[PDB]
Each structure stands twice: as structure tokens, then as C-alpha cells.
Design a protein around this ligand. Structure first.
Ligand SMILES: O=c1ccn([C@H]2C[C@H](OP(=O)(O)O)[C@@H](CO)O2)c(=O)[nH]1
Length: 120
């Protein structure tokens, strides 16, 4: 399950080669990554850092998740937050982008540890 949840976390939140930062990027990416298939996912973060840098976050000290578990970690990374505008429905979803280098919190599971969920 951690291997299927890990690939999904990959499809949904990672893009190291690019640096997005625009609505147009959010509109393209959200669709290339299959998140507007049936409904316009409300909010989504794309991390623009090397995969090994995201795995390296799992090793930081442990902190509480929004759910109460303690298998969560934090790191300051470059991201592009994609916010649905609410205008149109799938498959034509339109997004608003926001760039910043900010603090993200992900959940890691398994052995070796891998990111399986984006807390916030
Ligand atoms: O900064 C944020 C906040 C939330 N989410 C997504 C992740 C979760 O859905 P997901 O597991 O399907 O990615 C959900 C609640 O955090 O919103 C992001 O992508 N970025």
C-alpha cells in the first residue's frame, strides 16, 4: 500500500524539472497529472524539488499530523499552490497559482520511509 500511495504522492505533488508559478501551469499540470478526471480537485501543491530531496524530509525529526499521528515531517521547499477558481467543471478546470518557497508538511510510512501523504 505504501508503494501505491508513494507513486500517487508522486503523480500528484512532484515536479522537479519545472518551476511552474503560473495559472497556465496549474491548468496544464492539474490535468496532465489526472486530478480533473471527474471533479476539479479543490487545492493542490506541486513541489519543485528533486525526488531524493523529498524523501530526505522523512528523516527530519517527527511532528504531529493534522490527524494526531506523529509520522509527519516538515521542510521548506519551492512549490506552486493551485487553487480552483470554481468557474467551470471537469474536464475544463481553471486554477489560480501562487508561488513561494514555503514550509510543507508530509507524512512518511514504510521501511525504507517514503512520503505517502501531503498534510499541508
Ligand atoms: O497546501 C496544501 C493543502 C492541501 N493539499 C491537499 C492534500 C490533500 O489531498 P491529497 O491527499 O489528495 O493530496 C488535501 C488535504 O491536505 O489537500 C495540498 O495539496 N496542498
Amino acid at each position: 500500500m505504501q508503494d501505491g500511495m508513494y507513486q500517487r504522492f508522486l503523480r500528484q505533488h512532484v515536479h522537479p524539472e519545472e518551476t511552474g508559478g503560473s495559472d497556465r501551469y496549474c491548468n496544464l499540470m492539474m490535468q496532465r497529472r489526472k486530478m480533473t478526471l471527474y471533479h476539479c480537485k479543490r487545492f493542490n501543491t506541486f513541489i519543485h524539488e528533486d525526488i531524493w530531496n523529498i524523501r530526505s524530509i522523512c528523516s527530519t525529526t517527527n511532528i504531529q499530523c493534522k490527524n494526531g499521528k506523529m509520522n509527519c515531517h516538515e521542510g521548506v521547499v519551492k512549490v506552486t499552490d493551485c487553487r480552483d477558481t470554481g468557474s467551470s467543471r471537469a474536464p475544463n478546470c481553471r486554477y489560480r497559482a501562487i508561488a513561494s518557497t514555503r514550509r510543507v508538511v508530509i507524512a512518511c510510512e514504510g521501511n525504507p520511509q517514503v512520503p505517502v501523504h501531503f498534510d499541508g
